[PDB]
Paper text:
We studied a putative BADH from an early MRSA COL isolate, denoted SaBADH, and showed that it is a functional NAD+-dependent BADH that utilizes BA as the primary substrate. BADHs are a group of enzymes from the aldehyde dehydrogenase (ALDH) superfamily that primarily catalyze the oxidation of betaine aldehyde (BA) to betaine; some BADHs also utilize other substrates. BADHs resemble ALDH in structure and are composed of a Rossmann-fold NAD(P)-binding domain, a catalytic (substrate-binding) domain and an oligomerization (bridging) domain. The solution data are supported by the structural analysis and emphasize the importance of the NAD+-driven structural rearrangements at the cofactor-binding and substrate-binding sites for enzymatic activity.
Among the previously functionally characterized SaBADH mutants, the Gly234Ser ([name]) mutant, [name]-SaBADH, had a higher affinity for NAD+ and decreased substrate inhibition, suggesting the existence of a structural and functional interaction between the NAD-binding and substrate-binding sites. Thus, this mutant was of particular interest and its structure determination in the apo and holo forms provides key atomic details on how the [name] substitution affects NAD+ binding. To fully understand the kinetic and inhibition mechanisms of [name]-SaBADH, we determined its crystal structures in apo and holo forms and in the presence/absence of [name] and compared them with the wild-type structures. The first peptide stretch adopts a helical conformation extending helix αF in the presence of NAD+ and interacts with the adenine ring of the cofactor. Although this segment is unwound in apo SaBADHBME(+/−), it forms a similar helix turn in apo [name]-SaBADHBME(+/−) and apo SaBADHBME(+)PEG. NAD+ binding results in displacement of the Cα atoms of the second area by ∼1.6–1.9 Å. However, in apo [name]-SaBADHBME(−) and apo SaBADHBME(+)PEG Val288–Ser290 is also repositioned in an NAD-dependent manner. Firstly, the adenine ring of NAD+ imposes structural changes on helix αF that were also observed in apo [name]-SaBADHBME(+/−) and apo SaBADHBME(+)PEG. Difference electron-density peaks around the Ala212–Glu215 segment of the helix of these apo structures suggest that this region might be flexible in general and that NAD+ binding selects or induces the favorable conformational state.
Numbering used by the authors:
A (entry chain D), B (entry chain C): 1 to 496
C (entry chain B), D (entry chain A): 4 to 496
């Protein structure tokens, strides 16, 4: 609330903070108490178009795209340093806007600093290749250029974190960008734009559009001046975005959700597996792309595991993200909580058991917030909607498996392929399983870790492309083969 | 006609040569005389589905996907050697099916051998990376795996050449593939499948579907078991394919056409520029993705250039591709010639001049074939359909430019971005221009060269992704981050 | 042998030694002379180097396209496979090892040439995003130049391939000298390369151990890289000579390679692989597992099992199907191995089995030495620290993982080693702490063209095989173009 | 200077020489003693190496995350920028070059540390697709280990940064010894690194005579890499000493760098850059353009223009803004330069201008030597072939592109050179044929952290700067895991 008195309420287009063309606004809510905490501009499709045209003009001017990579790196580093400088206020703003614990928000800010620092350091480390040409008297080189004008659409769960994954490489490579954060969580994205403006970028290089205005998304994914659309969010919206991008054969990078398996063998460190099953299921109330919502446990220890998990779930502390004792905050919005609630009905109707949770808590200090109890669903199977579909809430399912081969078959039996884990003290076995899982990231005896040094993304319906790592940077580059004939001679194919 | 008596007429699905499920067939035509030369199976959508399921079963069996990269390379090399062994018959078959000169077909076969040889040698050279992890007591590695099941759709202009650009990296990386060549030019693709069978691949690893059956394309682009759709062809079909691929968030690699500029400065080697303008415009009767259909010539030499080009165009020798004196063969089909013809009407109506050509030739030996005269269109400008749209025939437009800046502006003023050239003895100038052109390939003082060592593909509406080179191989790989916690400890976030 | 060349190959011609001297080549199985070859002079070596320089400067190979160089290297690979049987037989005849081991070599050799053939045209350098506005910066990779290559007697053609393949793929000119006692397969491979066809002077073969031949090959001013595989003493001398012209050196010297067996290893696997590590090629392997380190809890069991198996090892003619271990290479080498037995006993170690020449009648004429196990020894002993390079292993116990690592690293060497344990996590921890170029987990011996091979510490400098191996034969050039040059005007006008 | 340390830095402590010996440091502008520092012993050097080894083995820096190591290297970069003024002044005081040149050095140094900071966490090694079924193959890149670093007097802190930055980024422990005559900025950077904070023994600074501690730094068994920048004679000695333990060497020695000026060069640009190439830092630059090669048709015009400009070069105190060229480094060095003038005249060359100490009163107390142009010389002469390393250039003519290339490559060196021509295609053709680590087209002198720097032939071994520079400080380990180990059963059961 302190920081909010100085935070911008506007969009940032072509070097200026500007309101919506029609003066529309949106009230931003704190999910802990459903109170309005801020009011921001709700931009129009014409605003989005203007931002894209500004990004294109800036790209063509070359002020950023032709800046030295070393200098671009120094600027990205300056953003990183600002994130660290404002770590406390940023973490508080993120907890206020998204509801997650302040400790989780601090962790995000540490990661965000590291993301910008990594890409700053990567900016000037390539440039392309020299090719030994198969044609005598020619020089062949591949030059890597910025892809161009990029549109970036981020989700509500980790707004600034996901923004950093897109902004850092775009700026390091010399692109121009237009970003639109989730309409319900724009606060830390507005703040990072203020911080980037303090660092200084050429007019139009960076643009922030706010809202969920009519056709705003369609303009960001379907405009002819866009070279890459990068979207993180729901599968249905991602598919729509990809179909729109097709209208101009535009590159797409998508990170959609997952149905992430947490595979626990009977020779896992049992108390570790229980601890990490809770962590996988319930960090940020399960509102994580890579949440471990699908637990697969070996039959021999399944009963022991379920009882241990359930007993721990009953003790999870719900409350205000600002209170140090809180272990799990509320879910993000009324609409999202309703969707979670509707999945409980689906689960029961198809024959699954709600072993614990599965409703809103009654406690007085939680009544005004968007809370939902941490939930464990048992007696289910792979045919069920509750197992196959991403609920994106504080909910896990538990299925048993007999053998290593069955664990792999079940884990791969989904439309998704983002991340997962294998818990076993037999590292050779864990490695065998990891090699067979169709997942972008596999953890052995861990759950959740990601970092700027390694690419992240999904097989199958979890996405297209990668974020983070050298591969993440590559989404923002395009290759050009320049072939010079150093002794050109007439071909004389056509008669003289 | 000799080779045709032993050539298969069937599809190749799951290790067997099989007819269409409905026994339908298609007559294949020789464009030189419009005679039926062969009759092949015309497959159904159910055939395509069966091939895809076979490819998936084969992929999951691991017989090819878990074969050593070195051994996969040896097999791809064996295909390369077969291409060379059968060079003469393959070249003849390609000229028979597509109409281009036998000399052009020989060049194709030399290129095809080199494409398979390049990928054979690349197969075992990069399995991923070790990452220095930012988390203590963890090991981080990125493993590159085959992307999975791939569908491959090739065009009629260079059937076997374009097939090799797709097959070679798919097999080198360990993917399973389903290929469908253009319905009007299947002959050399059938033959290469016979040759691959001789080398030996596990059942289902390679599949050939033939036809343009109802919903065949839709199944190949929209099936849930496909991990990558790779399509080379027309922009309208490519967009449709991408939209269908979106239904399962499937990776797409597209190479659509271009409106490829041939930029000739007043300080070019003039006779070289004239020679290469002819080559750019009229190889394969202009039916080249990268044909130099859009000549941009400096105003100072434009009159001289037009006269020199026109005088040469009048001498181009049309005829049978099998006759050694032929310099340009027919176009591919009645439908395609009609499309080219309709553009002549469009050009005149919008105010351009048909300086030479622009009709079917009258000569008696050309009357039965699908010939169209090499054509030069003058007095045109960037606003015109004839300049903006890909005609894909033996037709060039000529526009003038005043300055280097105007040449760049005009060259980039199209929806495409595949390839182009800059002719100037001032290499520094040519490099400045090359750096500003939004094209996947730029030639300086040359026109047409491509090779397996360097990536090929388009900016903007010319495509998504790359073929050839290391980047071409990468389309057929997927990255997996395996993170092992080597000293796992309880996090104890959730109370005990 | 009736058709094999007896000469050196210099500047496109098979030629005798300048002084007509020859050397008799021996089969270690029966000590019979099997062939007679030219014994070259230092002047022959100088002529070869000058021919290699002239060929390099002509550009006929160095400026050939990388793709075409790869095709030629592939053609050599194919000739190896075509002549696999005869090459394997020549290698067994010359070196004494089993025909099965020689076949394995020829498969590896084919694969080495095939790997480098495929690599030849895959990386010409990089484009650098220059920090100076209006400049273009690129790094071009060129062949390093003229290279001299000196190979050992244990795996003559194998070690030759590791050097020849990258040199030819990158466009270098080379002068090779195989071990004076084992030239046969190297002569043959030169015949095969000549059939493929290379410009005159690109490849040259010097034969012998003539006075100063080695010195010329390591110290000549026209050499850009000296690549030597052999003994530590000779390697050091070669490096010192190379210094006279600041010449790049690549060295692979021996090792004291540890074979670490934990009490939770697959016991019969560990015994099997301890035998393999110790006795393949009668232990005449740079990476032989001569130093067994076994956990104390299973040490007695392990020693008894190992010793009982060693007593059954079948010695004989490498051509006989039942032979498991052939003879050692020469009288001098066997004498050196014999002298180490004396050293071992004098410093207090026990010769548990073996430690002498076998008595059997069919082995009496050959250079055989019994597979030997030395027990009750420790890290202070010469028998543990020094590379014996014979069919001899030592056995030391360790208590903990930390002690195994300490002992394993307690040598001047750093080539290769193994860790046997069913606990893969533990094996990985140990592997990370061993100062060794190659570490095997639950295996012993494997190497391949796809991965670099070489030593930490006194085991060498540089790497062979893999992309790193290729890089020894390249040099980087930074070409920086100022595209808008302006006067600096630092100095007064 | 009143607050600058006078001591060595060994194992986390500032310490005097074991024998309390000291050395007086001189300012070449006036030959006045400016500071007195410890003159260490060979035992001090040994103690530093052993401390570096202990620190390496503790893993406090070598097992720190690459990301964290990068942050520390970045912190050093920031300290350099913070203390830019004082560092530049100290460098000018110690070495004599202009303050403006010293500022340029400090900006470069900041960028060198920043580059390597950003590179620290960007590799780690490779995953290999193994040719053996049921095996996992990976190459892990580890710090090479303990490194000794010996730097020259011409650009003390610049050359120190090229060595320190990659060593620290990769996780090595280092022992550095700056030139005995120019230790000031190196002492200062160690004070700054100490403020950033590194584990005890990770960084060590030895001060004094190459003749006392040099052999220990190049010949100690605990060293894994010796990195030396300096004279050819010393570099060779160092390499021979390193051979005693088969130790990796990286050497950057001088050059005889050609400045090739075609008749179609931008003439006034070529004159400007010829002066810059010849006379920055009084020609005391490893890559100084001492060998001018000019096309015959413009040679007379060029010589007249160059000579006329050389007469106007302003000599003086590096702290005075009008100074364009400072003094040479020492009495011994100036004497060596003077002796070359005698050599040049005796072999028939012409001293067209300069060739002696200046007479002006304000220059008499300093180690000044006039900028010199030597004409009428040829490639057979010592004055053309040998590196004088002073404010001296030779001028030779050439007729054709082929002759320019032949002459340019006709030296024992191969560090750097330039080609001036408006015909870029021609310049590129020439650049491709010059045996030089760096070739500038229409420029002279530029280097940067993003691109590797080093010499062909006798100019060195290895590279500094760029990704290749980082690689000198890494070692490859192939870890091969057999994931389904089976008995081989070679030996009888
Ligand atoms: Na909110
Ligand atoms: Na996908
Ligand atoms: Na046809
Ligand atoms: Na596109
Ligand atoms: Na022999
Ligand atoms: Na070494
Ligand atoms: Na001094
Ligand atoms: Na050298």
């Amino acid at each position: 609330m302190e920081l909010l008195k100085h935070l911008s309420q506007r969009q940032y287009i072509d070097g200026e903070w500007v309101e919506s063309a029609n003066k529309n606004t949106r009230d931003i809510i704190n999910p802990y108490n459903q109170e309005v905490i801020f009011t921001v501009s709700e931009g129009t499709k014409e605003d989005a178009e203007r931002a894209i045209l500004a990004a294109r003009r800036a790209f063509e001017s070359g002020e950023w795209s032709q800046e030295t990579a070393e200098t671009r790196g120094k600027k990205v580093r300056a953003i990183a340093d600002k994130i660290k400088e404002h770590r406390e206020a940023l973490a508080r703003l993120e907890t206020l806007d998204t509801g997650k614990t302040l400790e989780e928000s601090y962790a995000d800010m540490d990661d965000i600093h590291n993301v910008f620092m990594y890409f700053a350091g990567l900016a000037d480390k390539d440039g392309g290749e020299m090719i030994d040409s198969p044609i005598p008297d020619t020089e062949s080189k591949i030059v890597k250029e910025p892809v161009g004008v990029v549109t970036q659409i981020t989700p509500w769960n980790y707004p600034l974190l996901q923004a950093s994954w897109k902004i850092a490489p775009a700026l390091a490579t010399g692109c121009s960008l237009v970003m639109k954060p989730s309409e319900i969580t724009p606060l830390t994205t507005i703040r990072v734009f203020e911080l980037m403006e303090e660092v200084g970028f050429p007019k139009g290089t960076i643009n922030l559009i706010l809202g969920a205005g009519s056709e705003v998304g369609d303009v960001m994914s379907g405009h002819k001046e866009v070279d890459l659309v990068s979207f993180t969010g729901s599968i249905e919206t991602g598919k729509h975005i990809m179909k729109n991008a097709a209208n101009n054969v535009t590159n797409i990078a998508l990170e959609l959700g997952g149905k992430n398996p947490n595979i626990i063998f009977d020779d896992a460190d049992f108390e570790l597996a229980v601890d990490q099953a809770l962590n996988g299921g319930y960090f940020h109330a399960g509102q994580v792309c890579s949440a471990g919502s699908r637990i697969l446990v070996q039959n021999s220890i399944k009963d022991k595991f379920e009882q241990a998990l359930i007993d721990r779930v009953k003790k999870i502390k719900l409350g205000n993200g600002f209170d140090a004792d809180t272990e799990m905050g509320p879910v993000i919005s009324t609409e999202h909580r309703n969707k979670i609630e509707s999945y409980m009905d689906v689960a029961k109707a198809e024959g699954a058991t709600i072993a614990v949770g599965g409703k809103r808590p009654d406690r007085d200090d939680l009544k005004d917030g968007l809370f939902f109890e941490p939930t464990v669903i048992t007696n289910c199977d792979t045919s069920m909607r509750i197992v196959q579909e991403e609920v994106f809430g504080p909910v896990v399912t538990v299925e048993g498996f007999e053998t290593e081969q069955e664990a792999i078959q079940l884990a791969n039996d989904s439309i998704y392929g983002l991340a997962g884990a294998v818990f076993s003290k037999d590292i050779g076995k864990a490695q065998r399983v990891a090699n067979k899982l169709k997942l972008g990231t596999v953890w052995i005896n861990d759950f959740h870790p990601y970092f700027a040094q390694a690419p992240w993304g999904g097989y199958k319906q979890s996405g297209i492309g990668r974020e983070l790592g050298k591969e993440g940077l590559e989404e923002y580059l395009v290759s050009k083969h320049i072939l010079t004939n150093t002794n050109p001679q007439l071909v004389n194919w056509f008669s003289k």
